[PDB]
UniProtKB/Swiss-Prot annotation, chains A, B:
Residues 222 are annotated as: G5 motif. This is EH domain-containing protein 4. It comes from the Eukaryota. The chain holds residues 22 to 403 of 541 of the full protein. Residues 138-141 are annotated as: G3 motif. It comes from Mus musculus (Mouse).
Amino acid sequence: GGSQTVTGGLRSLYQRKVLPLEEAYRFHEFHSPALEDADFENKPMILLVGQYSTGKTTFIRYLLEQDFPGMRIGPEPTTDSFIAVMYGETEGSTPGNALVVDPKKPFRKLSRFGNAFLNRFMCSQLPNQVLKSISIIDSPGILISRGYDFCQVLQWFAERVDRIILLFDAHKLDISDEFSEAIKAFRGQDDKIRVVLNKADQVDTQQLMRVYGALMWSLGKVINTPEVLRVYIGSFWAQPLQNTDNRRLFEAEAQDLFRDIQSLPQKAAVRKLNDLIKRARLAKVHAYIISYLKKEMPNMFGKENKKRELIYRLPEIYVQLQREYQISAGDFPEVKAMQEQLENYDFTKFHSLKPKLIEAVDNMLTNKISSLMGLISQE
Amino acid sequence: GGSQTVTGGLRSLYQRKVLPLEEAYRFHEFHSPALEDADFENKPMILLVGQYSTGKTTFIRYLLEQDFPGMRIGPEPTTDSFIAVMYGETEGSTPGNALVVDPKKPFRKLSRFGNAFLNRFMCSQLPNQVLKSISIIDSPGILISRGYDFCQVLQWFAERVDRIILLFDAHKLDISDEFSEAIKAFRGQDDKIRVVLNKADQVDTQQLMRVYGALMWSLGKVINTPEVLRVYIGSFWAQPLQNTDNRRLFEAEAQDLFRDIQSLPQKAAVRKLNDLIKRARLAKVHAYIISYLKKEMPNMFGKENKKRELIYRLPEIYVQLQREYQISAGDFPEVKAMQEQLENYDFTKFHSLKPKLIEAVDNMLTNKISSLMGLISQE
Ligand SMILES: Nc1ncnc2c1ncn2[C@@H]1O[C@H](COP(=O)(O)OP(=O)(O)OP(O)(O)=S)[C@@H](O)[C@H]1O
Ligand SMILES: Nc1ncnc2c1ncn2[C@@H]1O[C@H](COP(=O)(O)OP(=O)(O)OP(O)(O)=S)[C@@H](O)[C@H]1O
Ligand SMILES: [Mg+2]
Ligand SMILES: [Mg+2]
């Protein structure tokens, strides 16, 4: 919702202040192409991983407080499939065979699995408050042999998703080997993982402590990290509670979960803002480099010879610029990769240093960002 | 209390039915010496392991519902020491320098640590209901450098103890490396370990689930076994509760703990009963062997020659006896170790087979034990 003001603030600041300095010095031919509007409007995604009949699909319904197309509660394993729940003007759905082609979607690379997975993948779209801020990806309930590498497709989402929610149900915690194998594939991104102990009101209080204890026992035994994961304990659906002895607990745990999900878009706005700052700093360095190569060329003759001196001397050039501009050697591009790319360029064609374009980036980093953060402080 | 009838039942059954068959064939010179009354009156022991200020010493007080000599609640680390709490006619105490000498105590082997440990070891004795059935061993609170191998002495108790209770406190779960090292030394006896999450009423319900989750997370991470340990959650002392939201839970967990401790003496009576059965079966086999060696000797000459034939043929003798007595090859002594020991014996001196002595053991295994178990069924 209001995050659209932040998205528009980055786009505006980039196109006005940063993109001119990138274009003037062929930034897009050395390091990274120009940012499209798709690089600013990305919403955070959540991946739901869990075994069959744990409550993933109902969990989504609970958050949306509304049904979504093709939800199918309690389906057959063969029919159970991946679903990308995303915002839409009208309640519709899109099969995975066409969703893979959509250039305005981050699912274009999924085409590499093809056929058997695409017949098990779709995008259900609906106008919903929750979906204006995040997207949710329901995975098939872990159980006999599918038609696609089920682990790699889970591992594929896990890398591009902002939050991974492992779901278990207290009424029948049966952590399997297929599930363990999946969680091991998620290692290296533990900072994205959160757990949900579902159906916690179906058992008595003691059994809840037995199951919850077993869950954490065999989790640390798998993930093998000192940083203990957060588990949200509760019954996540609209129905009344069965065992009410832990009512206060389940409600507090649901709020901690709501606050975590509701924080994701603000967390992404911060990440995008830092990326724009780092790109801006890299465009300055690139500009200082190209400008120094142009400045040192001769007025007429010895061009091809001088071009090779400068490339051979490029490491010394870095230090030369790190000293007379008080810039860190960290946000300098790799030395050798530059040398390799500078061969294909006529250094005389480069532009000279444009102070106007650098001041446009500097006054952005000092004045314009402090306000943009404030827009993120008021979530 | 009533377990004294079981102890006397084993002693009686052994001395009347088993010991005669052992003596008649020099069982005590081949396999194991005669059982003393100390081998029947052993009470089960519990080892308390935990960090400083967790509540070990108060835990004991809570179970005894009574103070014990030298309890010292909340002491200095240097003064904190091992304490063997055992039954006694009068409330007294015994320093470890003299307790090590007591032949009627299982602490005689502890003398190998000596001096620095003995100055940190004592036996507090008092007439108490709990102590008529079990003994408790309080260990120093884990925290700088003592005067004895603190890990090996913990590891020493762990092997001879029936129940090991790891204690943590919810108000400050700080599992340390010294504590982790100890728990790793206890591996290979996980069936003895139980956990106690103490002071569980000092935190709020959510923090209890956070701490309890961390405890099990880093426990399975250490012990590395599929069999998840049992944790008893509660506040184990006579004071009122602070956070009463989990009153029903803490009371149920305390009862599960009381039932576990109260089951130990009955569990030991079963183990002793099985040992007496296995010893009885070994004495029969030993008797059949010695008797067969006697039976096959010559009436006058060729004695030393025949003695060597029988020892060389001893493997064949086993099968010969396994067939005409329908006995398992499992409870036969090691072949080679017998051969080595039979060298020092005049086979002509052995007794012949005494059916009276074997029938005394057989009618024990069929009639007398079925009743002795019944005495254990009514705990
Ligand atoms: N909080 C809950 N408490 C009790 N039962 C629940 C709860 N949530 C879901 N269920 C039931 O659990 C069963 C499985 O429901 P689902 O939500 O479909 O689980 P799921 O299989 O993980 O979702 P899929 O596979 O993506 S359709 C249904 O019969 C639900 O009624
Ligand atoms: N259930 C409990 N709830 C709250 N505080 C407790 C509880 N049990 C003990 N304490 C307090 O914890 C502190 C440490 O007490 P101790 O029982 O001596 O712990 P301990 O150090 O493990 O025992 P030692 O070292 O063998 S003397 C004391 O101040 C007690 O009052
Ligand atoms: Mg689902
Ligand atoms: Mg103590």
